[PDB]
Amino acid sequence: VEDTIGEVLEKSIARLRDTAGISERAQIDTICSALAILRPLIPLSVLSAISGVAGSAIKSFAL
Amino acid sequence: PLAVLCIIIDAADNAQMAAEEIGETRSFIKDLIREKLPDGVCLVALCRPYRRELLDPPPEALT
Numbered sequence: 001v002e003d004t005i006g007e008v009l010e011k012s013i014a015r016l017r018d019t020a021g022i023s024e025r026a027q028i029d030t031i032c033s034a035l036a037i038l039r040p041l042i043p044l045s046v047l048s049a050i051s052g053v054a055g056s057a058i059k060s061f062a063l
Numbered sequence: 064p065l066a067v068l069c070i071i072i073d074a075a076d077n078a079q080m081a082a083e084e085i086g087e088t089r090s091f092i093k094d095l096i097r098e099k100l101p102d103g104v105c106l107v108a109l110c111r112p113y114r115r116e117l118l119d120p121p122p123e124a125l126t
Contacts, residue, residue: 018122
């Protein structure tokens with residue numbers, strides 16, 4: 001339905017950064033950079049191991 | 064019935080520079096910009112381009 005893809009997602013991620021704790025704001029960008037480079041069936045263990053972020057943080061971010 | 068009240072803060076960055084130069088962190092504008100005002104009032108600030116991020120706008124702000 002979006003005639004110009006990705007606008008609302010940009011707006012959503014910015015707001016989701018602004019309301020987090022001040023320790024979290026490096027880890028959010030780490031997760032985004034990790035998801036922008038891997039092959040498309042990512043297990044959570046390798047993602048956590050190469051990012052240093054806990055699994056529950058990734059899961060709550062995605063929810 | 065269509066009147067407005069305008070509040071203007073000139074030199075907004077200087078107030079934050081003076082606060083951080085003596086060991087504080089929260090000048091009045093840095094709190095006031097995130098507060099919710101009644102209807103029919105508008106809030107405008109002015110600053111230099113390279114100092115804008117001292118006062119840290121929220122995502123709703125217009126530039």
